[PDB]
């Protein structure tokens, strides 16, 4: 039960389900203490059973319990864990992650197969903790906390910060993902080349594996952090290391469209 | 009494409790029929239950009856003025002891909490809870700068004397976690409350000189 920035409180449906159970349980205790007739006690016990059922699995038996003023069924414990919006499929089998970005993709004809064009503004945010360390090693900032304050305001960012960002991303790779990820080559590792602009430059030869075109498609960017994560991406997930289709063994990164036509 | 925050079966069971109380207090010597006297207790029990159980955040009966009066008064002013009344208009109609400030606070109190599972949009795949940040647990940045400040502060305290650094760590609660009094420190070392205040400032002054010479500690001050 949290107070939002506006000032109003937000609470989960379980609290209302718990209150109904306690209200019915407490009333039964007083009814039993007053020696109420069996008909009254029978109804209260029946309501207690339904209160327990609604808390555990609302709508499984009988009409779903809803809050006054709306027809929305209260989210019970079973609903929290089951379904596509449940805990398993929304927070355990998949998660939202840090050090991630997203932008519109454009064709990088001049890029190498292992290279992608990453916007500098995205890379500054994606590699910020590494950049703060690099800025402190150089004379850009006295310490990390002062370095972070410099990057908070765009107009306070010096040109030496961009030079330090290049040293940060040297040898490192990023993960490019386009949804839906129907196969494993829907995520590939590329060495980012810093480019002016806001769009990611994608190699033409990996478009087929991503099923990507350039009519508004967007891709997610991810930063592997540790040595294991970087080594796995540079060795196992690098685009230039994945040239044959795992489904058939045929070349998946191959000439297509204008490349075939020109040849 | 339906539609006031309690289900129909809840109203009946609460009404049954008033019915039981009616039987105990009923007197047939007055020759009044039971339904005449029972109706008062059945309605009483239903009203009290609504004032006690119809809100996630419980509000006492006096404020619930105050909130009910405010709505009734505002509605009566709305139908007579042909528009939504202002807080000054509502307060004046309420009576003495009421101003626009009190009406606004009462309305603020009467705000029911909103569900964390309320969907947004036609698609049933987003809720309010997905857009509310957690402001209790420290962020990774906040946790890191706290560790950075701790290691820079103990590094600066290394330049101090063995006892001088101990006093500040003990007076500021850098060791036990609690700020101690110059007295609570006067028992650890057996010194006078003015001894500490004498050196504690001297150790404080030396850190000021060190900080001005290195300036490795100002950025943490914000």
């Amino acid at each position: 039960m949290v107070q939002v920035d506006g000032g109003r409180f937000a609470t989960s449906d379980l609290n209302d389900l718990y209150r109904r159970l306690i209200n019915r349980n407490n009333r039964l205790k007083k009814l039993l203490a007053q020696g109420a007739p069996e008909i009254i006690i029978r109804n209260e016990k029946r309501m207690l059973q339904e209160a327990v059922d609604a808390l555990l699995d609302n709508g499984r038996r009988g009409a779903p319990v809803t809050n006054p003023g709306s027809d929305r069924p209260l989210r019970s414990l079973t609903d929290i864990l089951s379904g596509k919006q449940g805990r398993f499929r929304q927070n355990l089998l998949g998660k939202r992650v840090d050090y991630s970005g997203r932008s519109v993709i454009v064709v990088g004809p001049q890029l190498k197969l292992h290279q992608c064009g990453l916007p500098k503004r995205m890379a500054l945010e994606l590699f910020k903790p590494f950049l703060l360390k690099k800025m402190e090693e150089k004379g850009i900032a006295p310490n990390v906390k002062a370095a972070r304050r410099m990057l908070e305001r765009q107009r306070d960012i010096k040109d030496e910060v961009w030079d330090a960002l290049e040293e940060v991303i040297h040898g490192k790779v990023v993960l490019l993902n386009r949804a839906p990820t129907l196969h494993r080559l829907g995520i590939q590792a590329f060495q980012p080349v810093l480019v002016e602009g806001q769009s990611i430059q994608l190699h033409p030869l990996v478009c087929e594996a991503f099923n990507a075109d350039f009519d508004g498609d967007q891709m997610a960017v991810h930063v592997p952090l540790s040595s294991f994560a970087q080594a796995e991406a540079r060795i196992q997930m690098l685009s230039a290391h994945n040239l044959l289709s795992p489904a058939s063994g045929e070349p998946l990164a191959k000439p297509s469209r204008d490349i075939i036509l020109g040849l | 009494y339906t539609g006031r925050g309690l289900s129909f079966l809840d109203l009946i069971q609460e009404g049954n409790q008033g019915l039981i109380r009616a039987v105990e207090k009923f007197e047939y010597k007055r020759r009044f029929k039971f339904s005449t006297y029972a109706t008062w207790w059945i309605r009483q029990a239903i009203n009290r239950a609504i004032a006690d159980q119809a809100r996630t955040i419980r509000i006492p009966v006096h404020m619930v009856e105050t909130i009910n009066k405010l709505s009734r008064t505002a509605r009566q002013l709305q139908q007579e003025l042909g528009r939504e009344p202002t807080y000054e208009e509502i307060a004046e109609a309420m009576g003495p002891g009421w101003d626009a400030k009190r009406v606004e606070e009462t309305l603020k109190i009467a705000q029911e909490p909103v569900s964390l599972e309320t969907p947004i949009g036609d698609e049933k795949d987003s809720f309010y809870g997905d857009f509310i940040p957690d402001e209790h647990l420290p962020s990774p940045v906040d946790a890191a700068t706290q560790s950075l400040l701790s290691e820079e502060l103990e590094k600066a305290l290394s330049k101090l004397s063995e006892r001088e650094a101990m006093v500040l760590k003990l007076r500021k609660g850098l060791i036990d976690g609690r700020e101690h009094t110059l007295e609570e420190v006067g028992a650890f070392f057996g010194v006078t409350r003015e001894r500490i205040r004498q050196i504690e400032n001297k150790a404080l002054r030396k850190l000021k000189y060190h900080e001005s010479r290195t300036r490795k500690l100002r950025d943490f001050l914000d």
Binding site: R42, R46, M47, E50, R61, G62 | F8, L9
Partner: peptide, 13 residues
């Protein structure tokens, strides 16, 4: 399946 109708039947006896 209807608790209200079940209760009304019980009080109707």
């Amino acid at each position: 399946s209807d608790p209200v109708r079940q209760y009304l039947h019980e009080i109707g006896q």
